[PDB]
Amino acid sequence: HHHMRRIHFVGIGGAGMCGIAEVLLNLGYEVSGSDLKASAVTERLEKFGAQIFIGHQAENADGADVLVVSSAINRANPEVASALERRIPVVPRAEMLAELMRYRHGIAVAGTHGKTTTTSLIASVFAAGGLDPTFVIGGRLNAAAQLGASRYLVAEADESDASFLHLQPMVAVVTNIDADDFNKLKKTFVEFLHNLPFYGLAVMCVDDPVVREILPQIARPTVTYGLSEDADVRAINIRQEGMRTWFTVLRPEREPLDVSVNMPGLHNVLNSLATIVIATDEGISDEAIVQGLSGFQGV
Amino acid sequence: HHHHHMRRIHFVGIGGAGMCGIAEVLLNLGYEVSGSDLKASAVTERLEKFGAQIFIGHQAENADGADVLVVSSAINRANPEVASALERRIPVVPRAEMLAELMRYRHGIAVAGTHGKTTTTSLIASVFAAGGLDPTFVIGGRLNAAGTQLGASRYLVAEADESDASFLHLQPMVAVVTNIDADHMATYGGDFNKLKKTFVEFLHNLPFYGLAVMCVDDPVVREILPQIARPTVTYGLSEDADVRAINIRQEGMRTWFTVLRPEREPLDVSVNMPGLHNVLNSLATIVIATDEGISDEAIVQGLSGFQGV
Ligand SMILES: Cn1nc(Nc2nc(N[C@@H]3c4ccccc4C[C@@H]3O)nc3[nH]ncc23)cc1C(C)(C)C
Ligand SMILES: Cn1nc(Nc2nc(N[C@@H]3c4ccccc4C[C@@H]3O)nc3[nH]ncc23)cc1C(C)(C)C
Numbered sequence: 385h386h387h388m389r390r391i392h393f394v395g396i397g398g399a400g401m402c403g404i405a406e407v408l409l410n411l412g413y414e415v416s417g418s419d420l421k422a423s424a425v426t427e428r429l430e431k432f433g434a435q436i437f438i439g440h441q442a443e444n445a446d447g448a449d450v451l452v453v454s455s456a457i458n459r460a461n462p463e464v465a466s467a468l469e470r471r472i473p474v475v476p477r478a479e480m481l482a483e484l485m486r487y488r489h490g491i492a493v494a495g496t497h498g499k500t501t502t503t504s505l506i507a508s509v510f511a512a513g514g515l516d517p518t519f520v521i522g523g524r525l526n527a528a529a530q531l532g533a534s535r536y537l538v539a540e541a542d543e544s545d546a547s548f549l550h551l552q553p554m555v556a557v558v559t560n561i562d563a564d565d566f567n568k569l570k571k572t573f574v575e576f577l578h579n580l581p582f583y584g585l586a587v588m589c590v591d592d593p594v595v596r597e598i599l600p601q602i603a604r605p606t607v608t609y610g611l612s613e614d615a616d617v618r619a620i621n622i623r624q625e626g627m628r629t630w631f632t633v634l635r636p637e638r639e640p641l642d643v644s645v646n647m648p649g650l651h652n653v654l655n656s657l658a659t660i661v662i663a664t665d666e667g668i669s670d671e672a673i674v675q676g677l678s679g680f681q682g683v
Numbered sequence: 684h685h686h687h688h689m690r691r692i693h694f695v696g697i698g699g700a701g702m703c704g705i706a707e708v709l710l711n712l713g714y715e716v717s718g719s720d721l722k723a724s725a726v727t728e729r730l731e732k733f734g735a736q737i738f739i740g741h742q743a744e745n746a747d748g749a750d751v752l753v754v755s756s757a758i759n760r761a762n763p764e765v766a767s768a769l770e771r772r773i774p775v776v777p778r779a780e781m782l783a784e785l786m787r788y789r790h791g792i793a794v795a796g797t798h799g800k801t802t803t804t805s806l807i808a809s810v811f812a813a814g815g816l817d818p819t820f821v822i823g824g825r826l827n828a829a830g831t832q833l834g835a836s837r838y839l840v841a842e843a844d845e846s847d848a849s850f851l852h853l854q855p856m857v858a859v860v861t862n863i864d865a866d867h868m869a870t871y872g873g874d875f876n877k878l879k880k881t882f883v884e885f886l887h888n889l890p891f892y893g894l895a896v897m898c899v900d901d902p903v904v905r906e907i908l909p910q911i912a913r914p915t916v917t918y919g920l921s922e923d924a925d926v927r928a929i930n931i932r933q934e935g936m937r938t939w940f941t942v943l944r945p946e947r948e949p950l951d952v953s954v955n956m957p958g959l960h961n962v963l964n965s966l967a968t969i970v971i972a973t974d975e976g977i978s979d980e981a982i983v984q985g986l987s988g989f990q991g992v
Contacts, residue, residue, distance in 0.1 A: 385976065387914035388892035449914065450891055473891065473912040483891055550887065552854070578852065581787055582751050582774065583689035603774040605688035605750065665685050 391480075392448035393417035394463050396434065397425040400477050401454060403525030404484070407518065407532030409433050411487055418444045418463055432530065442466040449473075452480045481523065481539075482547040485554075488518075488537035491662060492551050494576060495559030495589070498655050499540040502559060504683040505645075505659040506538050509676030513668040521683070536666075541576070549575055555585045555665065557658050560592035570598055580604045587661045589654060590615050607636075607665070609657040617661045619653050628678065629653055633660050641670050645677045684750065692781070693749035694718035695764050697735070698726045702755065704826030705781055708819065708834030710734050712788055719745045719764060743767035750774075753781045782824065782841075783849035789819075789839035792971060793853050795885060796861030796898070799964050800842040802956075803861060805992045806968040807840050810985030814977035822992065843885065851884055857894045857974065858886055859967050862901035879907055889913045896970045898963060899924050916974065918966040920959070926970045928962050938962060942969050950979055952986050 393405050396417025402425045405415050409432045416435040419426055426436045437444040445451060445463040451474045459465045467474050475483075485492070493503045500521055507519040511528035518527050520539035525531050541548055541556070549572065561573055577586045584604060590596045591610030599606065609617040621632040621642075630644040631653055645656040656677050663673050684690060692709050694702050697718025703726050706716045710733045717736040720727055727737045738745040743763040746752060752768045752775040760766055768775050786793070794804045801822050808820040812829035819828050821841035826833050843850055843858070863882050865875045886895050893913060899905045900919030908915065918926040929949075930941040939953045940962055954965045965986055972982050 385974070386892050387894050450912075468909075471908075471915060473914060475891065475912045479912070480891070486890055581689075582776075582781075582784055583687050585688050599772075600769075603776050603780070605684070605774065606772050667685060 388413065388449045390414040390416060390448050391450050391452060392445050392463070392467075393452045394440070394445075394461055395419055395454050396429060396436070397421070397423050398454055398477075400481070400523045401452065402426075402429060403531055404452065404477060404480050405429055405434060406432055406530060407484055407525060408480075410530045410532035416444070416448060445472070450475060452477055476546075478523070478545060478547045479550070481520065482551050484532070485537055485539070485552050488532070489535050489555075490551070490553035491517075491536065491538045491555045491557070492541040492553035492576075493538065493557045493559070493658070494541040494543060494548075494573065495557065495592075495595075496543075496562035496564060498559040498651060498658070499542070500683050501647075501652065502557065502655040502658045503538055503540045505655055505677065505680060506662050508680045509659050509663045509668060509673055510536060510538070510666070512676035512679065513663065513666075513672035515666065515668070543569065543572055543576075548572070549579070551576070551579060553580065553584065555587060555662060556580055557587040557662070558592075558595050559589050559654065559658060561594035561598070562592075570594060574598055574601050577602050577604060585665060587658055589658065591654065607661050609661050610654065615657075617657055617664070619657055622650075622653060624648060631656075633657065635660070635664055638664075641673070643674050643677050646680050647682065689714070689750045691715035691717065691749050692751050692753060693746050693764070693768075694753045695741070695762060696720055696755055697730060697737070698722070698724050699755055700726075701778055701824050702753065703730055704833050705753065705778055705785070706730055706735055707733055707832075708785055708826060711832065711834040717745065717749065746773065751776065751781075753778050779824065779847060779849055782821065782826075783847075783853055785834070786839055786841065787854050789834070790837045790857075791853070791855040792838065792840045792857040792859070793843040793855035793885075794840065794859045794861070794967075795843040795845065795850075795882065796859065796901075796904075797845075797864040797866065799861040799960060799967075800844070801992055802961065803859060803964045803967045804840055804842045806954075806964055806986065806989055807971055809989040810968055810972045810977060810982055811838055811840065811975070813985030813988060814972065814975070814981035816975070816977075845878065845881055845885070851881065851888070853885070853888055855889060855893065857896065857971055858889050859896040859971070860886065860901075860904050861898050861963065861967060863903035863907070864901070879903060883907050883910050886911050886913060894971075894974055896967055896974075898967065900963065916970050918970050919963065924966075926966055926973070928966050931959070931962060933957060940965075942966065944969070944973055947973070950982070952983055954986050955990055 397419035418437040442462040445466045451467045507528045510517045517536035586604045586606045590608040618634040619631040623630045698720040719738040746764040756777045811818040817836040818838040895913045895915040899917040927943045928940045932939040941949045
């Protein structure tokens, strides 16, 4: 009925691996893992319930329903070789990482520029609202308290990643689609957005020419943002004051809200606008949006 | 809306035989459903009794309040309901896309493969009904339920056509591949190779906790089996199938066979259709039924109760 009970990580002390294991533990799965040396990472994992093996031997994979490996599927590893011989699924860590969105309210931040900063800004505003998300930057899981505890999983989505077209987010942001086959690149972003359920939300920067271009092709609920006169969630009254930028944000069915972001540059007004759309969608108060954006120090 | 962005779905032409079933399921899921049609009918009256809001005629205002519009297929920008929706960035989707989407809300069992999808879908529905699971099932783009409340049960069984635009966007809990056959396409080319990758990508839409049900009698299914990084149960007459038919006795139009299953005693079943392919269709059904926890008696009675599509 449920065909994954025990997940085994080959190299579980690795920087991308330990976080995923911790989330799977918080989800209630049995997690085991092998690593070449014990560390604070593995010791923390066993206290969360991981079964830790030092060294690689075939028997370490016994009982596992699925194996997670760092990247390449290396049959020279005896744990992997045992799994493959017995037809146990072996998946790269990026695929298990994407899979985590199936269990959480996933917010995927895509686009050529601004993914990392916007992900960080969302995490800071959600923290100010007490929503304490787990968020993924550079393939590493962090919390804003065990990983995966929160209802929310905020993750950058890199268009060049093999897992990009397999995410199952509830909310997807596209900040821009930039040339830095471009037409195949556009279709990739359209297919990404159609992985939203019909009750999900596509958050689209209409200041970006290509995002605006593909907007009518997205058959999912949308909120647009930008400085553009037709953006649903719009920045006006922008006054750049040294290291902080003040602006008023217009939102559908809300009074104008005066905010500031504690970083200069017009692109950071855009990163903030994306964050505001998302925080607004989750019911975060004006006060928490103001504190998260203006209290922010950097990625 | 906030957090959940679909509350009301509007159907243009809701009285159509392909549309009314989808509306009924969405109503059973708890959504608000509205629909327009050129004339009232017994179909619209039934939908109104289930809670649908019915509009006769097409006027832009019929779409007011809708979060998503469903059209039969083509998106006709001359239709005032469609045009009003598009003007407001309300998604307008063909019914095949809304139909695919229903699997997200249900324990979806998608039956794929070049041959046998309809019979296997029907047999699974027959066995799940015998097990008291009251499945809704999809053959030919039409929704059906065990008896005559579409969508009431957790279970949704649907054929998955590789040539459909929604094929690589299904979210099943269980996926079947009966075979991957080139038919009149040649075997060792680029076209057939793209078809293989399509089936592999389809199976990778299973969650890691889902199940891939794979006919290893088929050469191409056997070929792609090592690429599937999902839990798999294989079936067939092959000696190495996890779930195997043996002791096959073809009796006119009725076929007896014994099924071997891991950790189970051999089970004698029969199907009321001739041909080894119907033994294969039955084996796929037994794998899924076994995985679901359905009793031997429901598997036997479900398979023998089926007379045809
Ligand atoms: C940290 N960071 N964050 C960004 N964020 C966004 N950048 C843009 N576009 C960009 C932009 C915006 C204004 C002037 C020049 C450019 C160039 C590019 O076009 N669009 C956006 N929409 N939502 C967010 C966002 C962009 C950047 C970089 C460019 C400093 C790496
Ligand atoms: C109704 N129906 N149902 C089927 N079901 C399955 N057919 C096959 N194989 C197929 C087969 C079988 C016998 C002769 C020719 C072919 C071609 C392909 O090879 N494999 C299977 N695995 N699970 C189920 C199943 C097949 C058929 C047809 C062929 C009568 C349309």
